[PDB]
Design an enzyme around this catalytic site. Sequence first.
Site, PDB file in Angstrom:
ATOM      1  N   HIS A  89      42.987  -5.861 -32.579  1.00 40.42           N
ATOM      2  CA  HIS A  89      41.928  -4.910 -32.302  1.00 40.42           C
ATOM      3  C   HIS A  89      40.963  -5.048 -33.557  1.00 40.42           C
ATOM      4  O   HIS A  89      41.282  -5.744 -34.678  1.00 40.42           O
ATOM      5  CB  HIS A  89      42.386  -3.716 -32.217  1.00 40.42           C
ATOM      6  N   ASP A  92      33.482  -2.199 -33.557  1.00 43.08           N
ATOM      7  CA  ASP A  92      32.319  -2.496 -33.668  1.00 43.08           C
ATOM      8  C   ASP A  92      31.405  -1.192 -33.576  1.00 43.08           C
ATOM      9  O   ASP A  92      31.614  -0.335 -32.666  1.00 43.08           O
ATOM     10  CB  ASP A  92      31.940  -3.181 -32.320  1.00 43.08           C
ATOM     11  N   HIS A  94      27.877   0.748 -33.538  1.00 47.35           N
ATOM     12  CA  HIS A  94      26.622   0.644 -33.103  1.00 47.35           C
ATOM     13  C   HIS A  94      25.597   1.215 -34.138  1.00 47.35           C
ATOM     14  O   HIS A  94      24.388   0.761 -34.134  1.00 47.35           O
ATOM     15  CB  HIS A  94      26.286   1.091 -31.702  1.00 47.35           C
ATOM     16  N   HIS A 129      33.263   1.059 -30.333  1.00 48.29           N
ATOM     17  CA  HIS A 129      34.069   0.287 -29.595  1.00 48.29           C
ATOM     18  C   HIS A 129      34.932  -0.914 -30.278  1.00 48.29           C
ATOM     19  O   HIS A 129      34.398  -1.441 -31.236  1.00 48.29           O
ATOM     20  CB  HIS A 129      33.488   0.065 -28.332  1.00 48.29           C
ATOM     21  N   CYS A 130      35.954  -0.910 -29.657  1.00 46.66           N
ATOM     22  CA  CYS A 130      36.823  -2.368 -29.978  1.00 46.66           C
ATOM     23  C   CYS A 130      35.951  -3.627 -29.663  1.00 46.66           C
ATOM     24  O   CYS A 130      35.423  -3.308 -28.423  1.00 46.66           O
ATOM     25  CB  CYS A 130      38.452  -2.174 -29.558  1.00 46.66           C
ATOM     26  N   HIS A 139      39.206  -4.675 -23.763  1.00 48.58           N
ATOM     27  CA  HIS A 139      39.694  -3.603 -24.462  1.00 48.58           C
ATOM     28  C   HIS A 139      38.742  -2.348 -24.595  1.00 48.58           C
ATOM     29  O   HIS A 139      39.339  -1.261 -24.655  1.00 48.58           O
ATOM     30  CB  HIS A 139      39.454  -3.910 -26.176  1.00 48.58           C
ATOM     31  N   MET A 144      39.001   1.838 -25.386  1.00 48.18           N
ATOM     32  CA  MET A 144      38.609   1.901 -26.914  1.00 48.18           C
ATOM     33  C   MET A 144      37.193   2.015 -27.077  1.00 48.18           C
ATOM     34  O   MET A 144      36.436   1.158 -27.494  1.00 48.18           O
ATOM     35  CB  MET A 144      39.178   0.575 -27.364  1.00 48.18           C
ATOM     36  N   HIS A 249      24.317  15.551 -15.428  1.00 42.99           N
ATOM     37  CA  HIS A 249      23.618  16.588 -15.063  1.00 42.99           C
ATOM     38  C   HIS A 249      24.584  17.780 -14.904  1.00 42.99           C
ATOM     39  O   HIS A 249      25.722  17.502 -14.539  1.00 42.99           O
ATOM     40  CB  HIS A 249      23.695  15.966 -13.425  1.00 42.99           C
ATOM     41  N   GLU A 273      16.523  17.489 -15.245  1.00 41.70           N
ATOM     42  CA  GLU A 273      17.673  17.828 -14.435  1.00 41.70           C
ATOM     43  C   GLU A 273      18.780  17.084 -14.603  1.00 41.70           C
ATOM     44  O   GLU A 273      20.010  17.276 -14.588  1.00 41.70           O
ATOM     45  CB  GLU A 273      17.136  17.786 -12.793  1.00 41.70           C
ATOM     46  N   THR A 274      18.665  15.649 -14.522  1.00 38.85           N
ATOM     47  CA  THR A 274      19.523  14.728 -14.750  1.00 38.85           C
ATOM     48  C   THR A 274      18.954  13.685 -15.797  1.00 38.85           C
ATOM     49  O   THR A 274      17.519  13.531 -15.768  1.00 38.85           O
ATOM     50  CB  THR A 274      19.750  13.762 -13.561  1.00 38.85           C
ATOM     51  N   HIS A 300      25.552  12.028 -11.634  1.00 40.02           N
ATOM     52  CA  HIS A 300      25.102  12.306 -10.353  1.00 40.02           C
ATOM     53  C   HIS A 300      24.861  11.240  -9.346  1.00 40.02           C
ATOM     54  O   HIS A 300      23.770  11.208  -8.526  1.00 40.02           O
ATOM     55  CB  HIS A 300      23.745  13.498 -10.972  1.00 40.02           C
TER      56      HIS A 300
HETATM   57 CU    CU Z   1      41.116  -3.191 -28.962  1.00 43.95          CU
HETATM   58 ZN    ZN Z   2      28.662  -2.454 -28.369  1.00 47.94          ZN
HETATM   59 ZN    ZN Z   3      22.645  17.798  -7.869  1.00 46.77          ZN
END
Ligand code: CU
Ligand code: ZN
Ligand code: ZN
Lengths: 336, 336, 336
Positions: A89, A92, A94, A129-130, A139, A144, A249, A273-274, A300
């Site tokens: 593993h 990473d 961001h 994330h891995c 993964h 992950m 939502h 709303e969303t 939603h």
């Molecule tokens: Cu992994």
């Molecule tokens: Zn990424």
């Molecule tokens: Zn709705």
Amino acid sequence: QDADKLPHTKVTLVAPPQVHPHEQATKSGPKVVEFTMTIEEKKMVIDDKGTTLQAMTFNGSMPGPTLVVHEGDYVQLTLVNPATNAMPHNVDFHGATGALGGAKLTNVNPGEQATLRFKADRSGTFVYHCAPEGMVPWHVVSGMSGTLMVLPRDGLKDPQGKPLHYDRAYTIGEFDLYIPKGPDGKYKDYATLAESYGDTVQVMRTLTPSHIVFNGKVGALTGANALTAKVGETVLLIHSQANRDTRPHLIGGFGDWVWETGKFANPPQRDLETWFIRGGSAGAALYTFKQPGVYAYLNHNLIEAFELGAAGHIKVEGKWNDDLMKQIKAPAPIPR
Amino acid sequence: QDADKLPHTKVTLVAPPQVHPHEQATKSGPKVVEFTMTIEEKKMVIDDKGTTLQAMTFNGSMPGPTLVVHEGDYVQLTLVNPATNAMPHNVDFHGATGALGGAKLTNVNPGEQATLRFKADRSGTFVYHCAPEGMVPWHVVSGMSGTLMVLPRDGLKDPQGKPLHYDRAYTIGEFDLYIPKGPDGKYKDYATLAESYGDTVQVMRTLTPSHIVFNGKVGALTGANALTAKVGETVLLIHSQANRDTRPHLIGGFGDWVWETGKFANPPQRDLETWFIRGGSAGAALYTFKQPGVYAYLNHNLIEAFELGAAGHIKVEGKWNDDLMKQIKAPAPIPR
Amino acid sequence: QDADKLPHTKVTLVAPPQVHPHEQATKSGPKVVEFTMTIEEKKMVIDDKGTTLQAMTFNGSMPGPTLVVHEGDYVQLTLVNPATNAMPHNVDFHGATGALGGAKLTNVNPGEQATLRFKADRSGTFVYHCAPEGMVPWHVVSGMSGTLMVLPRDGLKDPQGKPLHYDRAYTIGEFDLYIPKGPDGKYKDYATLAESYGDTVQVMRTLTPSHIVFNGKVGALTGANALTAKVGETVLLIHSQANRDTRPHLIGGFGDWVWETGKFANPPQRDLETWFIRGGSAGAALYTFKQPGVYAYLNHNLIEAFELGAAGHIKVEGKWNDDLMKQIKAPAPIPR
Ligand SMILES: [Cu+2]
Ligand SMILES: [Zn+2]
Ligand SMILES: [Zn+2]
Ligand SMILES: [Cu+2]
Ligand SMILES: [Cu+2]
Ligand SMILES: [Zn+2]
Ligand SMILES: [Zn+2]
Ligand SMILES: [Zn+2]
Ligand SMILES: [Zn+2]
């Protein structure tokens, strides 16, 4: 502004959907904030039909815990991969700059650990994330990923620069799962993680998840495990999706202030709303509850929410406000 | 600001794609605006191959009619479910606060009606949709959704606060349909609404619509039913998608000012080629026509538009402007 | 401001991923900028398993070349369709007003050409694509699209109006491909473009691409063909997707300033981890490299990137900065 000489502080992480204790606005100057995470590969039951997932997690949970620091701090993570795991593993971030987000410096085989430090120079909620060479998507879709929240040292602000506060934060990781089915139309159950690989990549290539879940399983954030709040309280809802788009939502609620792309130096949008969380990102919404009751918080695409699993509940205590909403006439026979 | 004592006004709704008469900027103070909608379950022909949908609608149309109020008004809806329907229904307003958007207070069985009032305290275009416990997605994808437009009391404004006006408004509801096919490769035709249920949920879970239509059927907004405008006129295009994302585009036109997340207190973006409507939301775009002719207004996933149905036309009268576009040389043999 | 009397300048286009030489801020006044493109239908190998695509291109490449002008200029394109092609084509500029983006004035059969002029009155990155009546999606998904970049005459600006500059521009066209498979589970290889039609439309209607590639093929922007930059350099990454949404991400990097909807009169957002390009649009991101090494630039649906092809590399030279990221402890046995 040399990290080697700054004050170091160790933080104890907590399981989702809570978020470890932290300050919003702080008078502290830059620190090196140290965290530790241990990878756990494990089979998990992800629905109420007995379906299992040969899952891969940071710290035993989906998603992994949210790490919280302030803009200008340094994140220092020790990533442990026990010998009881079968795969290699890495991680990473961001929110980090260079070396494939730190993945190139954290490749750990079962029985190894590594420590990475990076400057958290931008505010916002970021996915981590891995990403092991040759099997990145497997993964990630196996569980992950989690969020790094880098708060502005001044706390969150609206478009005009007015302070915004939250009383409680919750972290929701949404996972598009690709569980294989055998020729009998039933989901396959594997003895080992490595056994599930090939079948899983074939389902992944269809781009059609078998299940889409919040926090590791259908209904994870319901019942005894429902999120909670009270009328008058402002909640921060962090939502991460490391592989696929989603559209959060709150039923009966709003995104009062939302950073859908999740980057706090940009002005938030109000009254949503969303909102939309791009696959490969984390976003955040603030909402101040004004009505009590049981709310649903969901993706939603309603098929994805109700049929596939992407929906949780928030149980809110307090007083009902008939000025915001009132039943004028209850269901009754149509006047004839 | 107690609704019980405010002036009440009854509004007559009109079918899409028109929108009932209303003011933009108004000198009126807050009112209780009363509306009525009657649910109609009905089989509809949705393409030109004879395919039918066991549809469910508000007021007989897909989408249901757009309701227009101003920020600070109260919406008061009487929802009727005749005894000639077979299912129970309700209504969830995304522009309302609490009780699952009003769904918890409007559960009506065939032969019943109910009246809900809520404060429309936020400006923007909001989806409303049915959401009966246990079959939320089926009712929504079968046609039960429309838009509530809450205008700012001052009318729409640009990012600097300058007034923006529209001369005509159109409402476009985009529906991802999941029509089952039998073993012979033909779309199934059901005798009753309840007969279509189980097959329909299986198609829904694939996440692949059989058809995606504007206003109830392939080509609904074409031919005699094409939208219309004139050069010099500013149109407001309201687009709702209650279940699935879409990306509206005017061929040969622009989104001059667009609120893709549909919330009018946020500054609009200008000059958009294509905008994005998150599943579970309504958005709005303004465009002032500068060229005459037949435009297409479509979902710019072009397979979804041209193969599956998500495209309409706008026929625009007026004078051609060779300064904006001119054919310098018409198609002719390549110089040899 | 009559184009017939303005100065005319001819520009030589270059193949992606480069972009022809151009000014950002300019002291020039409005011009008529003349371009020529020749359509080439050709079979292309799109993966490393020998899979072919009966492709259709502008100028022999996927995507077609990026055309760069300034706001207020006129674009004048001569579109050539040799007699060695089998199909009719045209061009729809999303940056143009009227006549279906120019498609109605550029219908050219094999052996014909046409010249269109339009005012480029809005700044931003805009998609252009073919759109022949009755087969719009097939021509677009077979490769016919590229970007028109209309720069503000003053060059790009941040939200406060400060100047933003790029040292190098790259253009990435992302293509969702629908290659048919025969009953033996292998991708079909056609002798002619017309032979591939019917099978291709059936795969298109599933909405599931067989491959998703940057610049015409899996790994097109890798190896000898990787993008390049140096620490300290600011790159402009133009990303077009004419049919389907995508979510660009730089691994170990950021979108320092991003116009995801791609329209330069709107303020950019900063610090993005992952941005979103709506199907039917082009967007742009600026990033100033701060760390050397090999970055990946990809669609952060990771299945789409790693399994289906939507990922390239950027090789960056320069000095490693341990203040931004440092390996504190390399992978080693867990302390027991
Ligand atoms: Cu992994
Ligand atoms: Zn990424
Ligand atoms: Zn709705
Ligand atoms: Cu219903
Ligand atoms: Cu063509
Ligand atoms: Zn509070
Ligand atoms: Zn007007
Ligand atoms: Zn530079
Ligand atoms: Zn187009």
